[PDB]
Design a protein around this ligand. Structure first.
Ligand SMILES: [Cl-]
Lengths: 494, 492
């Protein structure tokens, strides 16, 4: 095994190829590496073998390589693990890092833990466009930058116009994390595609972002890829792509456990039509704004107000107008899905502390149509404003299905619940979120429980006259999509 | 024998000092306009410095004749009266003296009597116009902005870099690049601009270490942190621009104190006019009733203020803004902000909707309400700054002529901006009480903003009612200090 292909390679029948010699070096890495690194290098070994065999269909090496690949694949998938061999190998032949992570989850699932998680990941790995094969910009990136780069775009002839709008933005405090290079006519961005989309409120960024997209689309017109995908697949930084794949799976692996560990029975026992709190007629009977808030906050962590994206703005209105009323009940936090916690959270914390609103923050507030008065009043009353969403929740477009909505629902809820549960002891919250997230939602392995089930609170909805109404959960949505059905599911026997 | 020195010393080796005089002499003949005058004073400076350092050289007599010729060539006839004054300034700083000269040339003919004495005396009296070399060295041209300072932080580079990057992360202090090689900072903001951004903790700290670096760089001299930055770290371009603007203000204050028709104003705003005007606001007690008469065939109105605790001016315009729009108000004047850096940021905010991090910082620094700007943009109103760094209050030892400067220099910024507005659009400016009424001067007396714009000095109370404040006539006089001194007057 170890001392097999060593002496045979020395017999110079033909000069050793650069790619083939690399296979021997990759094989040395497997025997030396330990833990899951060994497994990651093992899938990489088979990937290098496929590329050699495909590029050299008829060579004397092939027979030795097929035995190696057979011996490597057989060494990884043993016994119960053979059920997930076909699915993980398929992914491993392209993304060995992603396949290696699924392999670790399979080892644990083979020992009785987290049933169906491996299938969900294997199915989602090829079903999610963000986890598709991608290399990005792989060149000599600059290390002296004052920030972590996300894109290394080459604008070509668009460099002229982009520079104008980038310099105009930086002059007004916008797009700080961005440095140019006229020698190569490339830009080194420190902002995600979604982050730049959030700053579009400012004309300066809108134009800078416009030429960035046009530069990408012009650089790859043959593929149907959109402006966003071209930047990831061809101009993204290796470190950003490495974390992006990790963050996407963190949500999937997070949506799974949320869909199985949530005590949904007790939520129905408390807030259903036949709930013991009988919250439906209590807030209806009790008149006044402050009385309704009392019943909605007694013995509770906080409250969750709905928002129909069509034209409802009562959530953001009530919290801004009736902030003093809410302060009486003891709420020192205001949650919103409108802002991303990745870039907006630190800027909000700095604003509430100092009192000076940063340019990037002011830009986000115009894009998301959030009034500046909400933040002025919040800082005055001594309150927090937390972003209950992140870039991780980016809704993908699964072709021919409705699975994209499932990810958005669960991914965003994970981020929203994570922040609300880690608040200081005693401080209650008043989060405004979409109506779709407050009630149940269809999944691909059980069903995505709404943010209400997660926090043990009811789904509320404020009227134009400040009257709270309990919105019953739609039980019909507690099922998997019809396109999931009872297809070939990777299931172990232990 | 003006060009005889070209081959006298040439036909021991010529030193760099004497060669500098020869090179400077050739520059005088080649240069023209005011540059020739500036080069002439610079020539006499080199001659003075050569003789002062080499008092025992055969070239002194040759250079002494050259100094006579140049000095006698500049100050001819009636112009000789301003020789002793302008020459004293010339040996220390010729560019400043060159500007005074141009003004003095035309004064000899009859225009602006006493402006030369004002400038000549203010050149030495104003600490900002003192000699200042600034930074002598390499100036990077790829900074992307006009650098105002090139401070060298010895043991404070570590702490400054911390708050600078913390500022840039929040969109503050973008125009400032570091050089770890020399441990210097190519700062693109002025001293007052950083003071106006003190509201933000990020800047305040960086501004604190910026001073400490300067204080330790020159601890022996009893100069303030600000002056040390000018005298040893300011960019040559910024120093030339600073001295220019300071003299423009003095020259601008003279015009105001001699061209403003104070009689026409005083007759219809204080004497019979006050009694008749006071009855309008007294009788008509409505909110719109008062604004109608105060804007009756007028450019606008001016509300006074006392920085102690009175903030009715800022509070009134923010609240009843719609009421002001009915009579014809559009522009909203404001002393608190300074046009130099704030005006472009305001024009952006009102247009694009996104507030600049630096603007937001300024608003908190000057304790301005943010909703004033929000309501302005929504109602389609403009906000302009009626102040600048040009009106930098100077500390003149043993006298109160420093108060005179800001009183007049600030009004020039206010008046020039308020007058140059679209035809038909009225304005509502909030300013200090001192600036609305008359103030003491050095040549004459600095007239307030009310006299120049032909408006009254109003002051809104807590119950929203305009009360006309009488102009203090006692202040319409020159200081007892400057009066009856060596006056520099020309022949008719
Ligand atoms: Cl500039």
């Amino acid at each position: 095994n170890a001392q097999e292909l060593k002496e045979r390679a020395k017999v110079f029948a033909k000069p050793i190829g650069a790619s083939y010699q690399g296979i021997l070096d990759q094989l040395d890495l497997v025997h030396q590496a330990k833990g899951r690194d060994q497994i990651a290098a093992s899938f990489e070994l088979n990937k290098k073998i496929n590329d050699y065999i495909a590029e050299h269909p008829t060579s004397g090496r092939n027979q030795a390589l097929t035995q190696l690949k057979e011996q490597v694949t057989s060494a990884l998938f043993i016994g119960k693990m053979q059920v997930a061999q076909a699915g993980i190998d398929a992914i491993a032949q392209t993304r060995p890092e992603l396949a290696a992570r699924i392999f670790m989850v399979a080892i644990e699932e083979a020992n009785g833990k987290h049933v169906g998680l491996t299938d969900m990941m294997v199915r989602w790995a090829n079903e999610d466009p963000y986890l598709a094969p991608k290399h990005g910009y792989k060149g000599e990136t600059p290390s002296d930058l004052g920030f972590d780069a996300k894109y290394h775009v080459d604008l070509g002839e668009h460099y002229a116009d982009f520079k104008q709008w980038l310099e105009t933005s930086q002059s007004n405090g916008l797009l700080s994390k961005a440095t140019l290079d006229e020698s190569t006519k490339t830009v080194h961005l420190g902002y995600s595609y979604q982050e730049l989309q959030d700053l579009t409120g400012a004309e300066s960024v809108q134009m800078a972002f416009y030429f960035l997209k046009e530069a990408a689309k012009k650089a790859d017109p043959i593929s149907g890829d959109s402006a966003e995908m071209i930047l990831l697949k061809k101009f993204a930084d290796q470190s950003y792509l490495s974390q992006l794949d990790s963050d996407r799976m963190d949500q999937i692996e997070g949506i799974y456990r949320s869909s199985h560990e949530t005590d949904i029975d007790a939520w129905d026992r408390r807030y259903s039509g036949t709930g013991y709190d009988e919250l439906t007629n209590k807030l209806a009977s009790a008149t006044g704004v402050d009385e309704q808030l009392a019943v909605l906050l007694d013995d509770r962590k906080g409250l969750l107000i709905g928002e129909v994206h069509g034209s409802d703005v009562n959530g953001l209105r009530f919290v801004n107008e009736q902030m003093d009323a809410l302060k009486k009940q003891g709420v020192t936090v205001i949650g919103l899905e409108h802002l991303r916690s990745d870039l907006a959270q630190p800027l909000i914390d700095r604003y509430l502390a100092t009192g000076v609103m940063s340019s990037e923050l002011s830009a986000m507030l115009k894009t998301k149509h959030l009034d500046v008065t909400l933040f002025e009043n919040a800082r005055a009353n001594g309150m927090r404003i937390v972003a209950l969403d992140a870039n991780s929740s980016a809704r993908p477009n699964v072709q021919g299905t409705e699975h994209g909505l499932m990810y958005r629902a669960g991914a965003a809820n994970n981020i929203a619940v994570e922040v609300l549960q880690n608040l200081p002891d005693g401080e209650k919250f008043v989060a405004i979120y979409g109506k779709a997230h407050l009630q149940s939602h269809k999944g691909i392995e059980g069903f995505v429980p709404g943010i209400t089930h997660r926090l043990d609170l009811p789904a509320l909805k404020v009227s134009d006259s400040n009257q709270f109404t309990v919105e019953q959960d739609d039980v019909s949505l507690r099922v998997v999509y019809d396109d999931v059905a009872n297809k070939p599911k990777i299931t172990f026997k232990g």
